[PDB]
């Protein structure tokens with residue numbers, strides 16, 4: 001059971017791409033209500049439920065309150081784009097780095113379609129710009145984005161900074177792996 005149907009999208013992405021595994025430290029951006037965080041805790045063994053496997057770590061961040069989850073730490077309210085938020089992230093992550101950065105952040109909808117899409121792409125870019133401080137070299141970045149003209153900039157930057165960038169469909173996700181960075 002999950003706090004949101006979003007879980008199922010992350011479960012499917014991980015099934016194919018194998019981005020979550022025991023021991024990995026995960027940062028989950030736009031984590032409320034916490035379904036991606038629930039998946040992440042299970043797959044990286046953050047609650048230690050499996051004694052036979054490394055114990056990962058999960059930190060979720062959102063503007064909105066997140067109810068406690070066994071095996072995750074949450075920072076809320078916290079704006080992922082606020083410089084204070086990165087420092088708080090660095091203070092909490094084991095070894096001051098994450099192995100996987102997940103992002104399901106989206107602006108609140110306005111009914112202006114280009115504007116909402118562009119704002120989404122902008123969030124992804126701001127997060128990528130703070131990734132050098134947070135993301136383990138070799139690590140993974142998965143973000144919700146929109147697929148079009150304004151997205152090409154984000155896709156180019158990911159291509160420069162990761163060995164491999166996949167576009168994943170049925171909303172669009174970029175999955176960038178093997179951070180140089």
Ligand SMILES: C[S@@+](CC[C@H](N)C(=O)[O-])C[C@H]1O[C@@H](n2cnc3c(N)ncnc32)[C@H](O)[C@@H]1O
Nearest residue numbers: 006030032033034035036063079080104105106
């Ligand atoms: C679709 S929900 C995420 C659902 C989550 N992945 C889950 O599985 O429960 C999008 C979230 O992005 C958050 N968000 C939007 N902009 C943000 C920002 N600048 N910093 C932190 N969170 C943000 C929103 O508050 C909202 O909760």
